[PDB]
Amino acid sequence: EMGKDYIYAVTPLLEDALMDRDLVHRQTASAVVQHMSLGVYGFGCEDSLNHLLNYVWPNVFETSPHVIQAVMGALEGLRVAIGPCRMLQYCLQGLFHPARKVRDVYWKIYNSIYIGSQDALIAHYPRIYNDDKNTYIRYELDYIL
Amino acid sequence: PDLIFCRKQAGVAIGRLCEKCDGKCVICDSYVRPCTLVRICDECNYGSYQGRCVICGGPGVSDAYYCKECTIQEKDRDGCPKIVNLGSSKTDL
Amino acid sequence: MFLYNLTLQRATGISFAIHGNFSGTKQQEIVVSRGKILELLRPDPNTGKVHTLLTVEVFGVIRSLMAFRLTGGTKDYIVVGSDSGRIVILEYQPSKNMFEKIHQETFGKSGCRRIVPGQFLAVDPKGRAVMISAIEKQKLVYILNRDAAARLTISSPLEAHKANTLVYHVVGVDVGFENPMFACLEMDYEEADNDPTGEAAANTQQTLTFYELDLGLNHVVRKYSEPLEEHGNFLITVPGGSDGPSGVLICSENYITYKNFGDQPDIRCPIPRRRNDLDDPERGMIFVCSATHKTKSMFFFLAQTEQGDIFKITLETDEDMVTEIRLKYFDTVPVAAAMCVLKTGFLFVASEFGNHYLYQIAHLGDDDEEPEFSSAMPLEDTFFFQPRPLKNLVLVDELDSLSPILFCQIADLANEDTPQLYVACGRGPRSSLRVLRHGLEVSEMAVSELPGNPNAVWTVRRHIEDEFDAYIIVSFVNATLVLSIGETVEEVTDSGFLGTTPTLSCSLLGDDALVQVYPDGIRHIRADKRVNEWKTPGKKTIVKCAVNQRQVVIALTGGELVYFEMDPSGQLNEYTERKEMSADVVCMSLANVPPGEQRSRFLAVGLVDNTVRIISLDPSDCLQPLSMQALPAQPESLCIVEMFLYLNIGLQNGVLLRTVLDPVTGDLSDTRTGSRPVKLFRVRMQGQEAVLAMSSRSWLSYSYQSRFHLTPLSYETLEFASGFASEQCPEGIVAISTNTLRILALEKLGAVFNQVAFPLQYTPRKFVIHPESNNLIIIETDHNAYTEATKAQRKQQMAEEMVEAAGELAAEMAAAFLNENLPESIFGAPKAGNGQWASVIRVMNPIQGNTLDLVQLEQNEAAFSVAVCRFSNTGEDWYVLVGVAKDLILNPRSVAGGFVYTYKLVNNGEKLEFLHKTPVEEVPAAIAPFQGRVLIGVGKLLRVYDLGKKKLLRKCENKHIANYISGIQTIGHRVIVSDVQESFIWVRYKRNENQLIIFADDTYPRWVTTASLLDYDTVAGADKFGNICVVRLPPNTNDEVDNGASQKAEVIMNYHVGETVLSLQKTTLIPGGSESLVYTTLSGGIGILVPFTSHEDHDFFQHVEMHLRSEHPPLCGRDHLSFRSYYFPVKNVIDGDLCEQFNSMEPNKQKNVSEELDRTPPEVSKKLEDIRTRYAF
């Protein structure tokens, strides 16, 4: 938790390292992001960590095992630090993409976010409308007192 | 590597560690901040397996822990974390 | 911004109530579950009052609660199921007054999840197994055991999982020392998910399954599984073994069924119905709760319906088969969440909303002629009974509860100087408007006035063992009026005091000796009426005195104290030495002597020079100092008191000091309580000692359960007091006001707040305050309801369709049906309909509770909005605008339109005159006065309306709000709009172009319930799920611009409270205090959020919270940081409810934590009290 005063100082180095041709650079930088985000939790560095999440996310389309394993761990640490709401907002883009590869990756990320913090997601799901045959609106949440 | 986790429902038995891998996290292999005590299932603590190392299987001399990061992410809430060797048999390595 | 969280009034709603012998003795207690609070209650069998012994915050969600004990034990344990993935077993320790955690076993992840257990708890009646279950697919069983030291033992769990299965209720089956059994109501959904025609969903049946646990083989067997005729809610365990058969009662809609495995056939009894019921004929009936009572000879069940009617249930048996079920109407009570039948014949009823009740069971075995119903009666149609007032129960106690709070307002509408809380509470015909004040409710017993300005008064007994008082020496500045006690208040003459001189001291010294002191000297009069006139030489005037049982120490002008002492004989003994000091004294006093040892030795003297000094009276160290301490100003009175010994210094400015008394005065705590001098007086409370500080407000220091309190009086100004013991008041205060002489009493010791209630008709939604008259305008609405006209016409129609039965017409039940009416607050409102509504507008006086005007709206109209305002186009006239929905269906949602009523609010705010009715195309859900005009949210649209001659005229509109407008807030030309699912949206009004323009919004969705403006750029909001947030616009924000908006608001505060907040307000609660953010919940809780003053204060409380998170972790296995980060991570809030659990820890842990914080435990406790008294009380 002492590392909460030093995230802004390190973010430019990590921005350079997460956009780099060498795979080991990106793997180690994702390790750094994971340990930073888990080390500061409940102290309010959501701004810095949101900025870094913007640079971590482009690496989810990675074929290399150790790199994708580092990126998933960074994403699970950022879940704890930032909230399942922001992660769900990033993930809702490609759950029903036409491309089966995009769908594979996004459902992996969503299944992580779902197994961790399943009950917090009740408040963050988006509104989906009724079609001809099926009812998809949640009405109790629309009740007003 | 033919190594998986046991992942059965853990009971009241406590995991042990040999003196090689003594202060490590049974999940992430880290040495920083041991936090939560490890429970194993009743089958993995039985007979000649009683008191062996969770990670490697050698003679145990201390208790096994989850680190603080795994506790925060709730990785202590899965099944028994004993390492199972699928490539060999019971009385094998 | 950095905030600190403090609870003022904890929640009062009840979820679960269990009962057992938790202290281990022959008494019975009740463990109740508030939402996130665990509480232990003890009702007294001799007085019928319920007391609270213990209250603990668990920082989680309690979902289930059971009791058990082992064979041979005399103490009951507690098992809790929660939203941690853990199961905990608790034991009550009476000697320490705490819950000790015995065992804690972990099985899954946190949160109220779907497939992780925690929702259902079943225990074996013999106490050797416990099941914990989820709503879907997962069941675990633990085995309970004992060692030779009689300590509990828990085993590794066994699994009983079942895929695609839903669980309704789980119950342990009472077999007698055979293998344990559990029974569940299940439903497999695997085939309804594969049928596009939807008729596998139809005709899917509910089953009853029995799970047997083989203790010798250590595994679980599914033994029996039988489908049921109709779906049921909960099960009931029938006492088995040797005291009965061993099955279950299945409670369904319209029926109750008995089942058991083997050769036992099923027995069904229909639920009886109220005769001439005004409810909707299409509704069924279920049981909502139950209670079992088992005597040595027999057992019975008590069961309550949705209307509040309790039925007594019994079973007719043969050798081992049940043959009949008998039902019988018992009584009608408010609908309960749980009820317990205690030994000694008491029924505790925890209602699902409102106050709780303790009843005494007067009659069991019935000496009456009401009919009994049975399953063996042939019936083609149902049974019919007639409800009536209480016959078998007698109300003995009633516990106040604020749940649910729907709307609050903190204002000073009575012309006191402290504000009051005006709270809209309750549900349905049991709703009310309650006024909360801070202080103690006094019980006024006698008031009489006599001419004069009485500056002092005592209360004397005539010998030491008298249990009542004798005289009342009301002495003015120049005269003295000695009165007596006879319940017939008299002016006594033979008292012997003979006060032609004003009296400054009167006490009881000897066996039966009275001693009066005056500026002219001392007068000791025992049972022998002869004057031992002591006088002080010269003209020097005595200024003040101090008395006790054995010593009477005085001091005249100049500070020459004259120590006396009473020998065991009954005469004074002037001491050889006479002490002086630098300056005269402004106060002095001395401790009370105990009956054990001889007399006192401590004697405190305060000086005008801002100093108080202690003088010994040891015979070996007589009149030698021990301690000298200075003050910021001079004092007026002291009180060396017990209740560890203490000493109370009263400064003559508006501050009170309390220090620990010893030859070294170490501690001292401050409470500036002012505007007047502070006088101190000693009185009695709970048989213990107490002090009575007096200023512009009148306070009272007292200890309760080894806990000091400083609570004012909900009363007017006093001037003097004393104790009082009589058949009128054995525990009283003979207070003297300016130009009066009163006699008061107080019998409440806790009770941070103090209330008075004013009944209401329907559920209140909103009220506003009329600025000129301070009157309230309330709107009350209920779904599923009848208006008075609809009810009357329904009754008339039923009466005539009864009178047309064509059967000998000579005996008419219709005239008796039409005349008698059951009070709806007792028997319930006739809930009939689905899209049926009933609304009312009420104008109410807040001082008393009388209704000044009442408007009743038509049948299917529901009021949701109200505002009181002036319009710029007209003069200084007031107007009331109410928004109503027309024919609203909740599920699935649909309306027919809306209306906005306009009233004129005349006669100094006492009467509503109807003006017109404007139609709109959706529910008008918010109304806000806005710069001589009004803003109305019509469904999704935001509009500006002006007042016209025949309707409201629309001027401007914006149609880009997302879903639904629930609130509107205004400052300047800025508009804050709340959305149902999105957060706040910021809007500007351009006057010259007639535009409403969105210029900012939020990046997160929020189910907003309420909102409050903090300043021009900051909003505080609350959510449907239990969070509070604060949102601020960045400083660069351009108000004049033209996913939603480009400019976004920043979140600067996030906190999970645990209960749903419906009210927020920024206000000051105490005179001479700072501003807080107050909130109220749906559970009856009232809390505050307060800022830190310096960085060093904020760093100290952060360290305390960080250390208590590890050393004092929550009681049911939750993580504190994880619970406060429920839906969003915590941001910039410290939890003072955890921080204040420091004072409940054991001294070892207090010492360790204080060493960690580099302080002393008394220093840590004092910093906590300092921030609390700065904002709240």
Ligand SMILES: [Zn+2]
């Ligand atoms: Zn780890």
Ligand SMILES: [Zn+2]
């Ligand atoms: Zn295992």
Ligand SMILES: [Zn+2]
């Ligand atoms: Zn090892």
